Subunit: 206 residues, 6 copies
């Protein structure tokens, strides 16, 4: 019937976006999808329009805030980002789970708006590695990294507001962790009661 | 700090006890254990005292009901079975998760008594196979099987009271399912907040 | 020496094409490949020429039927589709297994033509979910879905003609199932007798 | 309805019995079991009566050959071994797959008697390791090992009579191989047509 | 030809013995085995002679120190423990890897004596859980636990002397870690050069 | 701090490049990356500039040899290939492991230059399959294949210079093998001592 919203947040460099992406590779569109956000920030190298993000002017965005197009929006690390209402509501009507790769501010917003949403915070094994991971993928640059690490602390302090916590120490353990959370929620009685309406009905008979 | 109670019920022959047993083989005593019940029913062949059950006279049991020794007890399939208070409370104090292999009546009891308990009902792919599985393990005999199948229907109708549902169609898929439920609960914020008190504290600092 | 043909069919929306695709991601070109079909039907959004299909006019196709270019061809869901002879025969000469994503009509054709071919039918857990999966991937549209579901029944009734059956209840269980069928066929004596000609010869000696 | 017989043979020391044993650890009695043979040979250390074998006098056995108690029997490595009819036929009636840990002579016997049986030969990566494995498990002794290696060659030459071949190079790859063969046979149309009679019937309806 | 010694040490309660035991369950005797130590300490409940340990008087042991029977021996947590020479040397001659569940003192001893030995230290995620694990398995008692935790610090400070480190945060991640170390060492050129002498020779020919 | 260089070589057609590629799919850029080489050889079909290779004229390359741009370079199978210094040194500074898909000549070069580098040779199960794999992926053509097989022997004779050996008999076993080698090296004390500096410090305290 209705699918489930999965908020996922982390200090930049924890590897959250790379986890969510590896997960969807093993997950068909009919079960799981991700929301593509709008944002003012400049496209990094080898980042196409309409896949990772929808890239729009600070002008275009201030007007989306106005036309009320966003389920949530916020300022993080000096730029505007947002999750458009139209897309999300459609996909969720079709029983498909949708992932939101958003910050703590966005998460707080979605939690009032959509109270059945589930949220996962991902932590690094140390701030020393948070910095190392950032430099290690050639996406981002010197100025931008120091900016993000200043807030890395403040980001991580919101961890307790989330339903689930993953320490991404080692990428493959972490991906299993995330796969599991999804798998286990799909074994909850509400959801399994629909998907096996078929079976149950015949079981209870002769 | 405190561990979690996992009620697991199923129509006889669904393979619930064999799943719980395979799970504990891959799970150390310090993380996971199972409660050993008392019961009037006669020991099957190759079933030792003090491992699968505590075998006691209908006399001995009527007195345990009296001395109030049980967290829960009930009549199922013509015999008395029970979960002793003393054992459970001890093990749970030590942060260890404990499994209860009990019927629907027992589950309803534990749910009022211990409201944070989680419960899993396991269903077979059909009643035709429920019977086949019963005959297929040489435990049980002709009389006893027909008795149990009469109630198999009534057992399965309580499935909706549980938090999680597993269709044990194929044993190894089912065991993963159960392993997962446990794994995912241990990723919930409450529990992960203790076990990583260490880490969190240092993360939020310099 | 010679590779094996794997026919795979299913009511539209069962997730057969998405399974076959996930399988090939973990399977090198020298062991496993898929046939690319020709078809009159219009390309869906984000579907390139020469990868998913070869898109040709109803004109171009009627002439391929004439020049006898197809190992098999048929009318399904209002359009023409076909598997070209030239491509298949080449790849199979090189010991590589080839997958055919074709309907029941096509399967019956290949079975007379190529009797050692193995066939797998994939079923959904219910027709209620068959429809849900179709709407859930944004490929296809309103008109087209109702058309396909009318025949979903008739499609599924041919299941018994196939060598293997998979109930795609949960995508990842299903992908293991399919991976397994391939793996197990490669453990058959005929095939293993070539690939270990080396070893066997020395074993039987001193 | 009816289960399947799995003959498994190998030159002594290939690790066939240890594979079959590890497999059953992950396989419930209602799906999979193993036949316990009778034999004249002396019990090794830490080998109990009635689990690995039924240990009987050369006298007791010559009489079983007479009373026709065996589905198959033979002389291998200087002793008599046998698979009793009574046990096998029972277990197979209940839909449970049964494994036969028997030699080539026994396999040839069962193949005429029970033509739907499936057979797996397991080979070592070299005869140099066959000897090493034999000495490496403290079961067996000096005299006995040299005796068995003389026939190791002759044993391995019957490999081509079997349906499936496994090269047990590395134990865990080999165990997956064997698990797979079983899994894939249970996905064959005959067997899956019973176990999902339920589902199929409803699929083909409205 | 010759097998490899695997020293494994940890502060009591880290779960090292339970890991080593789960590992051997998936590992045949011809590839992997564990040394059974002698010790003065009293047998815990449900601990048999000759499996976990060889239980001997302080008298019997002082004489083994004298007759020089031990490859290594030491005083840990108020008792004497030791690894007997005779057993180890035998098993290693047969190409089988042997595990030593010993303390830091023992490890230092074996490292001079047997320089190709590999060593793994296992750490807990915190000392708070080290204590929790100890109480959580009903083996050990109040007095004994506080004694061990006093030295838990001193034990863990020797971690840097070992070749490999595992943080046993979550039992199943840890068991994979250990399985891996073994697997990877068996892929080293020295060892793989013997086990595939066969193959290599033929590869390099025509 | 500093990452590790992984040389990987094999006779053409062994499947080494396809393994390395499947590995990186499950490995984030912050942990693992691959070096992109320069080469004179002509781009095969469906091979883009700047991903598989940097395609340059025999002219452009002779000048790179001159300007000393390469960590290593060599002539293999009638063409020039090379690993540029600039790229490698950067990525390794950031703690990321880098893979080098290079021949034996290149490997010998890197081993003097960078002595902590680890090297893996991959062998096919036979030369008969080496040829089959080459023809089986439509990359390469008739002339080119016979040329490479002549040297396949000479390539494989350098196997003993490497630290680790993989027999790529079956692709998925082989990929696990390679994943493992990486995983196990990251469990070595040197590397784990940095990545858990955090944890260790607190463990050794109260
Ligand atoms: N609130 C909000 N945050 C997002 C959105 N999309 C990405 N961000 C957040 O912005 C931060 C930086 O994103 P990045 O610059 O790496 O793309 C991350 O913490 C990410 O979760 C969005 O649509 N809304
Ligand atoms: N209420 C309750 N049910 C149990 C207990 N132990 C086993 N039973 C239940 O009794 C039924 C039959 O158990 P069995 O005869 O197979 O051992 C099962 O459904 C099982 O869950 C118990 O201690 N209390
Ligand atoms: N006979 C035949 N059927 C195919 C071929 N290619 C795809 N189809 C079948 O046509 C149906 C719909 O395909 P679709 O429109 O989703 O691409 C599916 O059942 C699919 O198996 C083909 O080349 N020949
Ligand atoms: N024919 C036959 N062979 C068996 C039987 N049980 C074990 N053997 C075979 O005898 C050989 C040696 O058995 P072992 O001495 O190791 O127990 C093995 O190849 C094994 O397959 C049996 O019941 N019948
Ligand atoms: N040196 C040495 N230590 C061992 C031996 N066997 C067990 N111990 C060590 O003694 C400590 C406590 O063992 P436990 O009392 O738990 O059996 C552990 O750290 C364990 O590694 C041994 O044979 N020699
Ligand atoms: N020395 C060296 N060999 C490489 C380099 N890149 C690829 N080659 C090697 O050249 C051989 C053929 O490469 P291919 O033609 O298949 O791309 C392979 O053995 C491969 O390892 C390189 O940069 N340096």
């Amino acid at each position: 019937a209705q699918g489930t919203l999965y908020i996922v947040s982390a200090p930049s460099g924890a590897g959250k976006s790379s986890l969510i992406q590896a997960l969807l590779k093993t997950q068909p569109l009919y079960d799981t999808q991700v929301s593509v956000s709008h944002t003012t920030r400049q496209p990094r190298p080898g980042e196409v329009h309409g896949e990772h993000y929808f890239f729009v002017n600070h002008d275009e965005f201030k007007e989306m805030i106005s036309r009320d197009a966003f389920l949530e929006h916020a300022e993080v690390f000096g730029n505007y980002y947002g999750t458009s209402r139209e897309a999300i509501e459609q996909v969720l009507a079709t029983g498909v789970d949708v992932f939101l790769d958003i910050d703590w501010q966005g998460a707080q917003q979605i939690r009032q708006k959509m109270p059945h949403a589930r949220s996962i915070f991902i932590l690094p094994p140390s701030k020393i590695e948070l910095d190392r991971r950032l430099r290690g993928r050639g996406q981002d640059s010197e100025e931008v990294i120091a900016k993000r690490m200043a807030q890395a602390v403040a980001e991580m302090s919101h961890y307790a507001e989330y339903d689930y916590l993953i320490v991404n120490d080692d990428f493959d353990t972490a991906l299993t962790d995330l796969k599991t959370i999804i798998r286990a929620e799909r074994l909850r009685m509400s959801r399994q009661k629909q998907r096996h309406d078929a079976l149950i009905s015949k079981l209870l008979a002769d």
